[PDB]
Design a protein around this ligand. Structure first.
Ligand SMILES: Nc1ncnc2c1ncn2[C@@H]1O[C@H](COP(=O)(O)OP(=O)(O)OP(=O)(O)O)[C@@H](O)[C@H]1O
Ligand SMILES: Nc1ncnc2c1ncn2[C@@H]1O[C@H](COP(=O)(O)OP(=O)(O)OP(=O)(O)O)[C@@H](O)[C@H]1O
Ligand SMILES: Nc1ncnc2c1ncn2[C@@H]1O[C@H](COP(=O)(O)OP(=O)(O)O)[C@@H](O)[C@H]1O
Ligand SMILES: Nc1ncnc2c1ncn2[C@@H]1O[C@H](COP(=O)(O)OP(=O)(O)O)[C@@H](O)[C@H]1O
Ligand SMILES: [Mg+2]
Ligand SMILES: [Mg+2]
Lengths: 43, 49, 210, 359, 203, 326
């Protein structure tokens, strides 16, 4: 339940917040872009 | 065959150039020193050893 | 108590809204009871490895037994104070057993404090256990005025700061936000390179705390 | 003087000699671990896996005093302190809760204990008792002897007891199960409990197993619940789909029962699960008379009773209530402190239900 | 032997600066008064005497430009700084949650005046509820440990807490209440003369 | 004396002695035991040990070489009230017909089984009590259980809500299972109301199974809201007795006020009669509350001599604490 949301948080702040220098890029796939949390969809 | 498995663990703050705290995984933690040939600067708090 | 022949009350439960003084009363009690004062964060218990719930309640009710006149201020019991986890529940079962310590705990006074009383189950509330419950309400006009005067005794003040107007201006303030508006009046005296706080500073402190 | 603290110990004439000292100084104590995975490279140097709980898991072998002929998966093995070689396979455990479903022997029930429904237990025996004790007509005429049947009748009345009479005359070990015994806070294992039950029954010299409230077990999938107490959906098919029928069944006899048949999965209804279905009702007048005839044995009474009229004073009613009324005439004796029961006790004990349960 | 106190941060020092911010002058000024000044102008506070704020919370639409300010203050600060996100506070092995929280905070105390940064606290700070399962119990324990070390009995040394949150219609008021959240702030979406500043800065 | 044995078997029990828990007695001279670290050991049995099974083990060879006092076992023992209760028939003032009822029903079997097993009869199952809360239900249950050495098992009807199918029936079953594992019991469901009028219905069938399926354990039911119960639950003919407490009558109320005031320092200005004998006034728990609040009232005024006016305002405050009607 809420553990999924906390996992989303872990992603959501690992995905920016500590630094950005990374030679690392993330590709994401979805069958339902609408349901994706707006926080992710952030530009 | 004439070899022994070295223990795997993770280092904490240095005390001297030859004193370093290591957590030995789910076991206890100790203070130990460099063998001879390890770069002290290549050791950081948390580096795996 | 003997002249009434009744048994002494076993414990105290401080409940109500958060930020209303139960912590402050506990700290002030530590200053004046002059019996041995011991305090436990509710989340310090149960913890990790088996027995850390058993040990931290049992030996706690052994050091308390040794110290005889003593106050134990459990804080935020709800962490474990809920209904029902095994060892988790075991910590409360042992706590209930230890507060079932018969006499010689007449010198052992427990004050556990916790906002949001609802979760706290009936197990510890039963008359064989903590008898007393105390709610801490939001202060009224005079009490808000007095807490203003308390948190503002350290202030540097302009002439004629009518604290009554501000106390009237701030209904429903549960006390902690009184300290908040005091700090905030300090804020909006500060950045204007001022030390003499003014009435409208308290007014807009009321404005922004809300 | 000093007080003893519950230390035991026998008197001197009952212990020691050199026997105990030699045994303790000679024999190595054995630690206990679980077994797994006979490595079995070629079956003459097999090796095994063991698990000392909370301590470790090891690859080990046998001490030549024991042979692989006695070792299987799990098998509860015991080894020595330092080289951990298998020294003994330890006996089974009573933990798997099969023990609490056991009756384990011929039940104290006969084919006349049934309250009038002897018709139904006889048609039952045609499909379980007859095709084990009278196999001279099934396979020669074409079909392998059947082994399993379902029952459904009045509210929780007598149904299970039929199974007990059959298992008595069948001379069969008896197991009786409810859905609760396939359920624990730990999930997934609830299905595995049926697997354990059939295996432990086949370790017996053939056994008879019975299930009650099969509606709660043999009831089909409910998707639209969207969760809830969902363990049923994980466990129940492992009965229904791993259950065997007349054809695919080993040396085992099975019996089903529930008061509510309308919800049962057709998979249970169809063969491979069921070989016959039987219906019951509230005990008829002959049945109600016969139940009181049975219970005349169950107490000491003034045995001049007009049970024929007592069964008619009962309107449409069960037979469990008949037992309750007999014990209620016992209550009549007790409240009067009388050493024996009487017909008036029976009459007003019947009225205890008939009047107060139906006023 | 006796070991030094405890047994944290490093020279990471993120790139961003106050020169790099878009121009949230109100928010930058407020947060810097909350954190930077009680390092330098605590000397002035002692004359003013108003018990410097030790806790500030940040409302905002998803990534409204607040963790930007978090990294800015983390880099630019002279005092010690620790950055542990709220979601990081978890465990299999039951019970250590509260202790690791208390370890982080005690470490903060021994590290001299320092600022603990916790992001996404909303993950482990939702309004308390009937903890009918173990996970709920543990997360509520995390919240209560954070609460009680932040005020529960012990007034800390002059440490500060900076927190980030997106929804914050959650966040049990026991956390929200002023004595531990002195000067909470909302970062709204940029608007007239704010968008101009941020275009100018980036461009 | 046994100095020869002291020179032999005390050496056999070479110190120190470890302590563990037995689980199997497979061999008359080898058992299988557990210990603190949770490991399991097939060990030898030395002949001097009692043939009954904490277990005392040799430190080196783990051999069973003693047995010792039991000071453990999980929290179910805490759920159980193993000790015979404290309150007696003398504490229930005037409510005496219920003494006869509960004696006839459930008191006699647990010290006289023959009255329900040998006298040409078979034992009953369960007895229901009803009446307003604080009128003596739990008190009479503890009184009757005090009249025997059996263990008292009280459970409220809505406390056993387990999640998956039949686990509430399991939570009922375990109480009967561990019943004769140490002595028969008096069971008492507080507030039977919940069970009959979705695991609660399966628990109801489990309850009727535990009643009838008879034995030694006697089973008490009780609640104030008896008027709602389904006849499937309160079925007369299987449910044996239906005991009733009226509102505390005059003499009952005198005894209850006297007992509840036995500890505080009364004054002759208040003979409790005015508090006691007028009407259908109050239940016994209301009497206890009145006495407690009067004691507190005297406390705040420092009147460590309780007076009439304390009781007067005690009533004036207490009697308003019940909700209205139409
Ligand atoms: N009556 C009062 N007089 C003075 N200060 C008060 C009063 N009531 C509350 N406060 C202030 O409120 C602040 C917040 O702490 P308080 O003791 O009120 O919290 P609490 O009720 O224990 O709640 P929490 O569980 O949220 O910490 C303190 O700094 C205290 O000085
Ligand atoms: N005013 C601004 N000036 C310059 N860049 C900005 C400004 N506002 C936002 N940004 C850019 O957009 C990002 C906004 O994200 P933010 O700093 O709020 O952190 P986040 O990790 O996205 O937040 P969250 O924790 O809410 O998910 C910044 O990292 C920065 O790159
Ligand atoms: N007429 C009867 N003859 C014998 N036993 C009966 C009768 N009526 C009820 N019973 C009782 O029914 C109980 C179990 O059968 P039942 O509850 O009907 O099984 P199920 O749970 O499948 O309905 C037994 O304890 C038995 O005493
Ligand atoms: N006969 C009695 N003798 C003494 N006290 C009684 C009696 N009846 C009721 N009480 C009081 O009422 C309470 C017990 O009544 P009971 O019906 O068991 O309460 P509950 O409904 O809470 O179980 C006790 O607090 C006791 O003081
Ligand atoms: Mg507090
Ligand atoms: Mg951000």
């Amino acid at each position: 339940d809420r553990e999924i949301q906390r996992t989303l948080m872990e992603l959501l702040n690992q995905m920016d917040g500590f630094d950005t220098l990374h030679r690392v890029k993330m590709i994401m796939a979805t069958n339902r872009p609408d349901t994706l949390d707006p926080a992710l969809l952030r530009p | 065959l004439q070899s022994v498995g070295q223990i795997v663990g993770e280092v904490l703050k240095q005390l001297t150039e030859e004193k370093f705290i290591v957590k030995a995984t789910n076991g206890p933690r100790y203070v130990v020193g460099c063998r001879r040939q390890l770069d002290k600067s290549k050791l950081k708090p948390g580096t795996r050893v | 108590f003997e002249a009434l022949g009744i048994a002494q009350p076993k414990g105290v439960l401080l409940y109500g809204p958060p930020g209303t003084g139960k912590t402050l009363l506990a700290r002030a009690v530590a200053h004046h009871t002059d019996c041995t004062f011991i305090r436990v964060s509710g989340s310090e218990l149960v913890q990790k490895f088996i027995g850390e719930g058993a040990r931290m309640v049992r030996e706690l009710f052994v050091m308390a037994r040794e110290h005889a006149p003593s106050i134990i201020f459990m804080d935020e019991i709800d962490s474990i104070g809920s209904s029902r986890d095994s060892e988790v529940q075991r910590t409360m079962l042992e706590l209930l057993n230890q507060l079932d310590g018969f006499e010689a705990t007449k010198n052992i006074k427990v004050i556990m404090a916790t906002n949001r009383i609802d979760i706290l189950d009936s197990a510890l509330l039963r008359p064989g256990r903590i008898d007393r419950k105390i709610e801490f309400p939001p202060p009224n006009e005079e009490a808000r005025l007095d807490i203003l005067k308390i948190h503002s005794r350290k202030m540097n003040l302009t002439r004629g700061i009518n604290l009554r107007k501000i106390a009237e201006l701030m209904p429903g303030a549960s006390g902690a936000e009184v300290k908040g508006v005091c700090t905030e009046a300090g804020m909006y005296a500060l950045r204007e390179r001022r030390v003499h706080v003014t009435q409208e500073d308290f007014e807009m402190a009321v404005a922004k705390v809300m | 003087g000093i007080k003893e603290s519950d230390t035991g110990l026998a008197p001197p004439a009952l212990w020691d000699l050199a026997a105990d000292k030699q045994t303790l100084q000679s024999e190595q104590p054995l630690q206990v671990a679980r077994c797994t995975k006979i490595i079995n490279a070629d079956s003459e140097d097999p090796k095994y896996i063991i698990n000392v709980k909370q301590f470790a898991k090891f690859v080990v072998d046998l001490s030549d005093q024991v042979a692989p002929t006695d070792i299987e998966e799990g098998m509860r093995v015991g080894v020595d302190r330092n080289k951990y070689q298998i020294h003994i396979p330890l006996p089974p455990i009573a933990d798997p809760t099969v023990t609490m479903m056991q009756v384990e022997e011929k039940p104290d029930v006969t084919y006349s204990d049934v309250g009038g429904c002897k018709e139904q237990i006889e048609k039952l025996r045609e499909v379980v008792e007859t095709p084990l004790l009278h196999p001279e007509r099934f396979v020669n005429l074409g079909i392998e002897p059947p082994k399993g049947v379902l029952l459904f009748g009045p509210p929780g009345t007598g149904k299970t007891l039929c199974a007990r009479a059959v298992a008595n005359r069948t001379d069969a070990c008896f197991i009786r199960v409810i859905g609760s015994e396939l359920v624990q806070k730990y999930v997934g294992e609830g299905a595995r409990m049926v697997r354990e039950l059939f295996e432990m029954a086949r370790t017996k010299k053939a056994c008879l197993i019975f299930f009650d409230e099969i509606d709660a077990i043999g009831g089909a999938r409910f998707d639209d619940g969207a969760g809830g107490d969902n363990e049923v959906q994980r466990t129940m098919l492992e009965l229904i789909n791993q259950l065997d029928g007349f054809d695919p069944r080993g040396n085992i006899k099975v019996l089903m029962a529930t008061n509510r048949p309308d919800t049962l999965d057709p998979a249970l209804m169809r063969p491979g699960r069921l070989d016959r279905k039987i219906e019951f009702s509230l005990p008829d007048l002959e049945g109600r008379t016969h139940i009181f005839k049975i219970h005349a044995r169950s107490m000491s009474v003034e045995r001049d009773i007009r049970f024929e009229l007592l069964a008619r004073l009962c309107p449409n009613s069960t037979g469990a209530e008949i037992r309750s009324v007999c014990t209620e005439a016992g209550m009549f004796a007790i409240r009067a402190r009388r050493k024996i029961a009487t017909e008036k006790d029976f009459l007003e004990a019947v009225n205890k239900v008939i009047k107060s349960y139906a006023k | 032997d006796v070991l030094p106190p405890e047994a944290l941060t490093s020279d990471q020092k993120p790139d961003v600066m106050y020169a790099d911010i878009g121009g949230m002058d109100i928010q930058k000024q407020e947060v810097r008064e909350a954190v930077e000044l009680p390092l330098t102008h605590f000397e002035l506070y002692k004359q003013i005497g108003i018990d410097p704020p030790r806790g500030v919370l940040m409302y905002g639409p998803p990534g409204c430009g607040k963790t930007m300010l978090a990294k800015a203050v983390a880099h630019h600060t002279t005092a010690a700084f620790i950055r542990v996100v709220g979601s990081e506070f978890v465990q299999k092995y039951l019970g250590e949650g509260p202790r690791m929280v208390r370890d982080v905070f005690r470490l903060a105390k021994e590290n001299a005046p320092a600022i603990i940064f916790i992001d996404e606290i909303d993950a482990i700070a939702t309004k308390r509820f009937d903890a009918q399962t173990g996970a709920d119990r543990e997360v509520q324990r995390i919240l209560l440990e954070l609460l009680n070390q932040m005020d529960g009995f012990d007034q800390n040394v002059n440490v500060k807490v900076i927190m980030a949150t997106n929804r914050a219609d959650t966040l049990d008021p026991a956390l929200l209440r002023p004595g531990r959240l002195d000067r909470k702030i909302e970062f709204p979406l940029p608007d007239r003369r704010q968008k101009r500043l941020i275009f100018s800065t980036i461009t | 004396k046994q100095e020869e044995e002291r020179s032999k078997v005390d050496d056999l029990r070479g110190t120190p002695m470890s302590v563990g828990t037995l689980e199997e007695i497979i061999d008359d001279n080898h058992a299988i035991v557990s210990t603190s670290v949770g490991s399991e050991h097939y060990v030898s049995i030395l002949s001097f040990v009692d043939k009954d099974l904490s277990v005392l083990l040799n430190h080196k060879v783990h051999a069973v070489i003693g047995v010792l006092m039991d000071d453990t076992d999980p929290l179910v023992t805490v759920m159980k009230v193993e000790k015979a209760p404290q309150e007696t028939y003398a504490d229930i003032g005037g409510l005496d017909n219920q003494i006869q009822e509960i004696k006839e029903s459930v008191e006699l079997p647990l010290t006289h089984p023959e009255y329900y097993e040998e006298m040409g009869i078979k034992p009953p199952k369960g007895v229901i009590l009803y009446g307003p809360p604080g009128t003596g239900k739990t008190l009479l249950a503890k009184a009757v259980a005090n009249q025997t050495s059996a263990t008292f098992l009280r459970v409220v009807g809505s406390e056993l809500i387990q999640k998956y199918l039949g686990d509430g029936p399991k939570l009922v079953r375990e109480l009967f299972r561990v019943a004769e594992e140490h002595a028969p019991s008096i069971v008492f469901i507080d507030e039977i109301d919940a069970i009959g009028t979705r695991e609660i219905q399966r628990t109801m069938l489990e309850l009727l199974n535990q009643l009838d399926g008879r034995g030694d354990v006697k089973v008490i039911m009780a609640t104030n809201r008896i008027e709602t119960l389904d006849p499937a639950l309160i079925r007369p003919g299987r449910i044996d007795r239906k005991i009733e407490f009226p509102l505390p009558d005059e003499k009952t109320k005198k005894r209850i006020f006297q007992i509840h005031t036995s500890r505080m320092t009364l004054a002759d200005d208040v003979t409790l009669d005015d508090l006691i004998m007028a009407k259908d006034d109050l239940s016994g728990a209301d009497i206890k509350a009145i006495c407690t609040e009067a004691g507190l009232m005297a406390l705040r005024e420092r009147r460590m001599k309780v007076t009439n006016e304390d009781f007067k305002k005690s009533k004036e405050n207490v009697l308003y604490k019940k909700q209205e009607g139409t």
